[PDB]
Every structure is written in C-alpha cells, then in structure tokens.
Design a protein around this ligand. Sequence first.
Ligand SMILES: [Zn+2]
Ligand SMILES: [Zn+2]
Lengths: 119, 117
Amino acid sequence: GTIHLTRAEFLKKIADYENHSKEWKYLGDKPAIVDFYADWCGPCKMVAPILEELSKEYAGKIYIYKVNVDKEPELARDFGIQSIPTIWFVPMKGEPQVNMGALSKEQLKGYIDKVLLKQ
Amino acid sequence: GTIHLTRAEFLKKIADYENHSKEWKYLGDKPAIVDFYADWCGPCKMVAPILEELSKEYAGKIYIYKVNVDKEPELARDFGIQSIPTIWFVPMKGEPQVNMGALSKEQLKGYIDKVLL
Ligand SMILES: [Zn+2]
Ligand SMILES: [Zn+2]
C-alpha cells in the first residue's frame, strides 16, 4: 500500500535535505592575499605600491588579490569588513588569517612567509 | 601584479562561500510520489483511496509515500508547504515536480507514466 513517512525516515528514503553551513574551502592553486580596500583609505594608497612589488617578488608563489568594497558591497558585507584595509592571508589549507589595518612591507613579508608559504 | 576581483570571480578563485549549491539528491531506488496530507483536509479523503489503488498497480515500479503535516511540522515548514494536499512527483534525477491541490486517478497516472517512468 502507501507508505507513511516520519521526518527521520524522510532523511533516509527521500533526501538528506538540510542546507548545512558550508565549511571554508579554498579553490586557488597558490596561496593568496586578499586585500579589502576603499578609494578613500589613506594608508591604502601607501600600501598599494608595496603590494605591487610583493606580487612581483613572490610571483609564481602566491596571488595578491584586491577587492574594492565600494564596487563589491555584497562580498564585503558577507565577510563583515569593517576596518579598511582588511587583509586576508589565505593558505592552501586552514582558515584564513585576518589582519585589520595597514601593514609595512616587512610585516606583509612576515605573513607571506609564515602563513602562506609555511616557513 | 595584483589582481582585482569581482564577487563572481571570488566565487571561482577563492571560495564558493555561499550556502547556495545544495544539490537535490534523491536517495530512493525507484521514483516516488510524496503526498503531504492532514486529517483536517477534505479533498485528501477522496485522494487517499486513489493513491492506495495506484500503489498496487504500480507496485515495484514506484513508491507512494504519505506525510502527515501535523505530525511532521518541521518537514512541512522546511519545505514551505502552503496548502493541503500538496503532492510531489520525485524522478530518479531532477528536482521534484510539485502540485498543490487534489488530483484525479487519471491525472496521477499522467505524472507517473510521464514524469516518474
Ligand atoms: Zn551572501
Ligand atoms: Zn529543518
């Protein structure tokens, strides 16, 4: 005849349907920096050229990404950006490490070496 | 040098971070009907015998399930049930086809032979 179904049975016979929160999973082929900045940020203008030269010095070893929070408000909001700049250090495996505020080249190199490249 | 990212590009190069994938993965070994009913439901009274009949003539081809929404409030709420009866036709692959309202034996056979089989 027809088959009566509890929710517990539904999960086994129909679909294990709950939309469980997704675990962080990096998709890039090299570790990365992700720099959340804005045009009106003072420090960022000094940091900007530092990131360009770091992207050359570590070329082939890392990516350095930039996100303009004004142009990408959904992304910025979803990641709770408050301090400008907010800099993410994203290793191939593990949770991103987050720094709020500006950093010197040597501070950046420190994070690149220890966090991105696992020295 | 540095690479600028749109959100769409972030989703590909960094992390597909939203809970927006989940694939509907039907777990059964044959197609199914799932009938969301309730005791307070008038038209369900007419549909019930029809389903039990269909349950027999298609035995081994499909399953016909029944969910009492008042006994399974989380299921009813999670799937946004808005009227009773609500009937699902669940294919081996693809999203289920959903019909709100009582159907006829002629109509149910329609979906079964065409959508399920
Ligand atoms: Zn979002
Ligand atoms: Zn739920």
